Design an enzyme around this catalytic site. Structure first.
Site, short mmCIF file in Angstrom:
data_model
loop_
_atom_site.label_atom_id
_atom_site.label_comp_id
_atom_site.label_asym_id
_atom_site.label_seq_id
_atom_site.Cartn_x
_atom_site.Cartn_y
_atom_site.Cartn_z
CB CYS A 1 8.34 7.26 9.03
SG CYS A 1 9.57 7.83 7.82
CG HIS B 1 0.90 3.04 4.27
ND1 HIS B 1 0.66 4.25 4.90
CD2 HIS B 1 -0.11 2.79 3.39
CE1 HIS B 1 -0.48 4.70 4.39
NE2 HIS B 1 -0.98 3.85 3.48
CG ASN C 1 -1.75 -1.24 1.39
OD1 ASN C 1 -1.80 -1.81 2.48
ND2 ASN C 1 -2.39 -1.71 0.32
#
Ligand SMILES: CN(CCO)c1ccccn1
Ligand SMILES: CN(CCO)c1ccccn1
Lengths: 263, 265
Positions: B223, B188, B186
């Site tokens: 992050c 991330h 995704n």
């Protein structure tokens, strides 16, 4: 995994893991490159090694000079990929390790790779030609007749790569290895360099294209405390010329080319 | 891998790979953490999830990790086979918990254990929320009803409060950035990358002479792909203990805090 019937090649199956895939839910080129190294390592172990007994006495090791990978289809998450690998003696120049990737369900070739390895002294880092005594110790583990993953004449795996000229069109600077990037001997894993080369490709290209071919020349190692800059220029399908160099003095560590196809 | 006979837990075997091991020829804690996520993902798939429920997807809700706690007694060697069993438990309206037990496939002995706390969040606004009755009713049939804990003990390390490291840090590793290999499907940052970043500020001498026995990590904020992180460590202690802090380079916004316990080799 296991050696084939003739004992001259090795095959192994892998199920693609959740953390091994990118935004397309298919294995990244770095996952593929890690699987190639794993099957190479299992082949070396199965035949008794990839240093020979004489190499250890002379403090000699095999080091990668060039890696070339061509992917037709990246395996999806949960799919099973079968990889076959073998080595071939290239006289006193060095050795070559080749791979063929297949979809385990259909049996079709979904990728292929080839790599050139040269002998060097592990302490002085001095390159050498292969001696007759060392070559005689590994020829019994190789097919004697040529067996090439890239047989075609004038194919991409043997092309000369030029040096990228400043200014680069794109760049990613200050890249540093962390402990996960190191191998068991505390050296940077060869696959980390593939990742660093790819970091300077713009995200828009990655989002709209699939990497079809990557050729990487390895000139010098990046040490654990070194910092790298990754440089890319479009040369064209989209083709790119790449250069990794130390952030400070600009010492070349790798050069390469990538070819990308529109999705 | 497969669900067990009662369908309330999942087991899977893994052969430790050459690139998965460190200087001792044994699996790194990041390899272990990746295997834990892989077996968790295979468990979710086996019971029909994708680990969002049908009601969660309608409401744009996802599970996010709040805390990860891992204890390793023996790291499996290169070429060894490790068996990992995982299960989930409902923790009422607070959220869910996923636990793991690692075993040597040859001896059958427990070589490690892990526990993780997960909270519900709206995927778009990032707003945390309690678990509704309707969502909780859809996943309780996939969990053991009676408690089953990887860390049963009364005052165990998995539930300890972690303080915030005070400047100046004893040790630090600055300017850490994720590359594409650190991202999940995704886009991330993978949770295991944060474990690697925390460990980067431990001096190499400690890593060369000690084995990591326990790591507890709190996840406060993510992050982003274009963010830069600073990893900070201070010794708090035959065993060595450390207090850790990851924060954004620049504004100093906390992303994680944690503790590690190391024993002499
Ligand atoms: C040519 N080499 C390396 C010899 O040092 C092979 C051949 C077969 C398997 C593994 N390594
Ligand atoms: C409690 N959950 C989360 C459901 O959203 C489980 C339980 C078993 C397998 C996977 N997820």
């Amino acid at each position: 995994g296991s050696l084939t019937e003739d004992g001259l090649s090795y095959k192994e199956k892998f199920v693609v893991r959740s953390y091994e895939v990118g935004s397309n839910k298919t294995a990244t080129v770095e996952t593929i490159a890690n699987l190639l190294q794993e099957v190479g390592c299992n082949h070396a172990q199965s035949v008794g090694f990839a240093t020979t007994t004489t190499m250890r006495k002379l403090h000699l090791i095999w080091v990668t000079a060039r890696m070339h990978i061509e992917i037709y289809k990246y395996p999806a998450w949960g799919d099973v990929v079968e990889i076959e690998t073998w080595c071939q003696s290239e006289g006193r120049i060095g050795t070559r390790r080749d791979w063929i990737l297949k979809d385990s369900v259909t049996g079709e070739v979904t990728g292929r790779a080839t790599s050139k390895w040269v002998m060097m002294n592990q302490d002085t880092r001095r390159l050498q030609k292969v001696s007759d005594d060392v070559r005689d110790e590994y020829l019994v583990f190789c097919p004697q007749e040529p067996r090439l993953a890239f047989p075609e004449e004038n194919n991409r795996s043997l092309k000369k790569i030029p040096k990228l000229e400043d200014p680069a069109q794109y760049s990613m600077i200050g890249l540093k290895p962390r402990r996960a990037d190191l191998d068991m001997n505390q050296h940077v894993n060869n696959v980390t360099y593939i990742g660093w080369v790819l970091e300077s490709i713009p995200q828009e290209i990655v989002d709209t294209h699939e990497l079809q071919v990557i050729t990487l020349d390895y000139r010098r190692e990046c040490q654990q405390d070194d910092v790298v800059d990754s440089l890319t220029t479009t040369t064209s399908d989209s083709q790119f010329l790449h250069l990794l160099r130390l952030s400070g003095d600009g010492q070349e560590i790798n050069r390469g080319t990538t070819l990308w196809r529109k999705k």
